[PDB]
Amino acid sequence: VRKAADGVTVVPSAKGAAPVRLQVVDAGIIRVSADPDGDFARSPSLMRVPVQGDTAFQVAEQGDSVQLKTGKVTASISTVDGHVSFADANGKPVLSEVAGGRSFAPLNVEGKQYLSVRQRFQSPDDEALYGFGQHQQGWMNQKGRNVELQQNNIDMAVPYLVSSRNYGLLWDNNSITRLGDPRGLQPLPKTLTLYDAKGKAGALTARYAINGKHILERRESEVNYQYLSDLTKYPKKAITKDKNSRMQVTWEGEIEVLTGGEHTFSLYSSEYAKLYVDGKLVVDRWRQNWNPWNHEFKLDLEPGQRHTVKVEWDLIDPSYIALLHRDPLPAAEAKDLSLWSEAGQMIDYYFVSADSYDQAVAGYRALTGKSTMLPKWAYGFWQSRERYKSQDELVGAVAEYRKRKLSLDNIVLDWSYWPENAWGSHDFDPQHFPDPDGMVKAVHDMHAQIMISIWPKFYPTTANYKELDAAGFMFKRNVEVGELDWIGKGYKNSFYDPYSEKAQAIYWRQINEKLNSKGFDAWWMDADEPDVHSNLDIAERKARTTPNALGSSTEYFNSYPLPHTHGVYVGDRAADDKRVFILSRKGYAGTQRNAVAVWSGDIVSRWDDMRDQISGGVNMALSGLPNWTFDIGGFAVEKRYEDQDPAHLPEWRELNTRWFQFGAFVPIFRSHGQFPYREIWNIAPEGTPFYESMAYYNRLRSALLPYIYSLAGDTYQRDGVIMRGMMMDFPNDPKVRDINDQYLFGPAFLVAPVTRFGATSRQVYLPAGSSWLEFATGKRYEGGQSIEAAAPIERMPLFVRAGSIVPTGPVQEYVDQVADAPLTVVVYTGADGQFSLYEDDGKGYGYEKGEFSRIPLVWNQAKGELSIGKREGSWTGMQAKRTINVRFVDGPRDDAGALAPKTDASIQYDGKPVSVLQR
Ligand SMILES: O[C@@H]1[C@@H](O)[C@@H](O)OC[C@H]1O
Ligand SMILES: [K+]
Structure with a gap:
């Protein structure tokens, strides 16, 4: 056990277990590096920026473990295999690696030797996971999902993950990276038995047409026109480049699994693509021909039974399609939180202890700027x-x-x-x-x-x-x-x-x-x-x-x-x-x-x-x-x-x-x-x-x-x-963890966009623990319920959380059009609330030297009193003296949602504390 100014290194006693090193970045941020060579040498990080935090810690040695303790975290390292476990300030467990859960595999490419690395963590069924970039499957919660980080036009990679169990993880690796299944999507016949449209094993039945006129039929053991190099197998007779001719391909047959459980699939496709399983429509998609992407689905399948598959593709030259598959992981690893990376030198990640989702994001900004x-x-x-x-x-x-x-x-x-x-x-x-x-x-x-x-x-x-x-x-x-x-x-x-x-x-x-x-x-x-x-x-x-x-x-x-x-x-x-x-x-x-x-x-x-x-x-x-x-x-x-x-x-x-x-x-x-x-x-x-x-x-x-x-x-x-997920402000409401078509625009506005043609209303779930005010009417709804919210073509469902203080201004054709515009503070009553209003010149970097102002706004529900506190800070062009209007929304009001609404009071403000009473 080797001590350092900022952490410890343990060489585990078990054969094959990689040396592991912990570094204290701050009281609540711990770096974990695992390297078979014991040197912890890596390419200089590109994502990290320096952090000057509290690096104090104390070490204790139990029987099989070394423990590092800060003011916020206790990290335990096994002396047998090096696996790391994290607990918070009160000793409650937060996150643990799987014991024996590291993998290192050689990858010899481009004149170098890299390691493909994989770290498994223990993950309970009720853990929710968010982040890891911006993706296109419509999944809000990422728990149990397979997500590959591979920069693409519509698919963005950011290797930071946040959990409902009060932590975040920064995975410092720059190569293609996988959450979940470390193997990625397989060709269709790899772990499936195929049967064509006449029951013959080994393939599906592919039929090609031009403008609705059949060209040829053949057996195919894969559905793969995924990339340009794959297009050389498309039947030359079935290709038309005519300006307004289209092509069609169908695949028809049956599949059968070799291992039972949850199977995941992706229909990667551009132009029109449908997929039927057991006659049930599963994918029905269009994308432009030059930007195909993954459209994933999942099925519970068991060996011994066949299931019908039918793919219908209507395309133009060139277009792309592929049907790919993942079979279940082994039971011993199927429930783990797993991170895999194609190329690096070691396992290197940061544990961020987070009392809230906000604090998790703050640790990412500490680590990367x-x-x-x-x-x-x-x-x-x-x-x-x-x-x-x-x-x-x-x-x-x-x-x-x-x-x-x-x-x-x-x-x-x-x-x-x-x-x-x-x-x-x-x-x-x-x-x-x-x-x-x-x-x-x-x-x-x-x-x-x-x-x-x-x-x-x-x-x-x-x-x-x-x-x-x-x-x-x-x-x-x-x-x-x-x-x-x-x-x-x-x-x-x-x-x-x-x-x-x-x-x-x-x-x-x-x-x-x-x-x-x-x-x-x-x-x-x-x-x-x-x-x-x-x-x-x-x-x-x-x-x-x-x-x-x-x-x-x-x-x-x-x-x-x-x-x-x-x-x-x-x-x-x-x-x-x-x-x-x-x-x-x-x-x-x-x-x-x-x-x-x-x-x-x-x-x-x-x-x-x-x-x-x-x-x-x-x-x-x-x-x-x-x-x-x-x-x-x-x-x-x-x-x-x-x-x-x-x-x-x-x-x-x-x-x-x-x-x-x-x-x-x-x-x-x-x-x-x-x-x-x-x-x-x-x-x-x-x-x-x-x-x-x-x-x-x-x-x-x-x-x-x-x-x-x-x-x-x-x-x-x-x-x-x-843009705030509903779980950021309501982390104790289980119903908001998986909803994929609602969010919060700042702390005040619950937004529920309408995504169906011809809809004049939609279901909206209001989180528990707060009442809500409909922005367009002022009607009050208690939390913890789903409602059929009115949504005529011209208006989107929008609700304001009780206690919200929303600073507003006049309608402007452009920023700062009206000079010295009056400020209208709108209070949506129903609970206590507060809002520290930030202002600066909006043009230069003077904020870096403290050129910004903050005006505290505090609403007390019992007293019905809005307190406008003492101003702090100044900047070039600040209004030293200004008009502040106040508007109270406590229920239905005729001009609710008006661009220029009625104000209930008005004061002149000069930076000294002032009070406004609703009465
Ligand atoms: O937004 C587009 C961009 O994504 C790319 O395709 O180049 C043209 C832009 O219009
Ligand atoms: K500039």
Whole structure:
């Protein structure tokens, strides 16, 4: 037993048990490293930042154990096999590794020897787990689920996990990583017996057609057109590339399992895909052809009995599909919490003791960095398009929002503003963008900010490619094989290597000269998975992104966006004193410290996709990234929407309206997508209920800005989140652990988006222990019940927790439009409450030096008294003296939810404590 200033190392006595080392990072944060070699040498962590905490501890030796005790945690290490167990300050057990539960296996790749590592933990049936990124299965609770971390367009990896048992876990590994089954999805015949449509064993029956005309039939032992390399087996006779011809494939047969229990499956698919098991529809999905993804299901199956399978695929060239399977784990490990990683040097993780879900997130921010404050205008409405094709189109959109007096802060310029053959030059095509400097000035003159797309992608004919390539920072393989992108005739292209500080310097310098010099406000840092060529198999994605400056893409598969965004953050911040804003398609552990917001990628205009974002956003927040958004309405659309078929116009309008209501209540409020156009008046004309609704929520957002921005300030000040899972504030209510279509927008607003076409109401579960006020009526509902909440097309169910204090302002066409606006404090009565209102200049980094104010608001229910406490702090432009209106909502009120509601009292405030009585 070896003692150190910050922990101990134990070499266990059992043969094969790896040495283990514990380090105290803080009283409630313990690092655990296990390494067969006993050296604990690893590649320098990319996610970690330094922590200066209380590293005091005391050691005791029992018979089979060494125990480390801080003020918050007791960690016990077995001297026999090294397995670690955690208990809290009162000795109550919290988390224990499985004894003998470590695995290390050699992986010899790219000239190195790595270990694939696996750690198993004991996990009770009633433990709930959240986080591990942002995913697309619609699962809120992750307990018992298999989740693979592999950066993809719509699937985001962040290796931080939070548990209902009052802890969090940071898994410091940058390779492909698996929660649950460490083996990943198997080909169909691996642990299943197949029978075709005529009962013959060994395969299913595959039938291929073109435009409803059968081409051929054959037996197939797998359903696998998953990646580009798999497409070479598609029957050449059955392929049509005609502009408006479609293809169809069916698979039909039976399956039988070899081991009984819970079997999980994934139908990976693009375009239209259905799957029937025993004649019951199990998957019914559409995605755009170039972005397939996993659609998982599960079945309880036992050997000896057959079950029918029928797959129906309706596609265009090219599309992708695969039916994959996992058989049950052995009983001894099937219930464990298991973390696996493809490539590393050792097992290395951090245990975070958390009295609340909030404290769990705070430990992630301690370990990987505080969440940089974003500009205040970033929390207003964003309008985007794929794509504005000229500067007249982009400027025209801002001007039309101004003409209609709709609220708009930010406008976005998508890809392809450059000359076609010059991706990566950051030049503008003069045909469509003849005066980029004048474009930016025209937007600024209308009191709006403009963000521009910048990829990690370069064409080999550009000066910028050759500068990066000559310095060694261009990945070479995609150009060596001559892979052509999708633009016009097709262009060779590659992506740069961001891991070296020298590469980041070149990348930013090019952007600074060409774009930052013209006044652009924000950077849309797209495709940083990186998406070198969509739908390559994983071996090719790795081979076309390796070697990097630190090692292989196998060791660093998920970490690309972290150094990529870091370089732009550092460069932009050194260029002037304004706060940076970045929208990155991928986040990762630590990306919040580089002023990076993220979004869920190229999801589709489908009701299922909309509902899936609710649980995606909650788990994103609990993974530790607080600034998150999506494309309102979805990104890619079916032909019935693209062609604007009048028969589907009502559903198109209802979907985008429901999704717009939802987007107004997520951290960043943003409209984007492919044709049709997505601006409010282009969704539906004025006079329709869709326009009325979108206009209402567009303006309501601006009135709620004091509330929203106060939460933004506390993402930094209190290491907090904005989008809150219902279990964060109601951790003792079991009914909120698994609900996947409700959440809290800050502490006050319970949000229940409507995700069914033609619904005029929906079930909403109200958490127990508080009463709730319907935002649109003031009707009071007691907690702990499900209700049929009214939801006409124009309004989304929204409820306010009793005791909520919500600072609001007047409707604004843009941030700070009305100077010295009055503040309206709205109290939703029914219980005690408090809200410390955060304010600052919203523009620079003065908050880092304490340039911010906090005004305490305290509501006492018994006395009916709102106490406005003494102001603390000051900043450039603060209102020393200001008008504060107060509004009390204690039940049904005629103007409930009005954009400009009646106020019940008004005082002048100068920073000294003042009291307002309801009476
Ligand atoms: O949001 C889109 C992004 O995900 C990618 O596909 O490039 C174009 C953008 O419009
Ligand atoms: K700056």
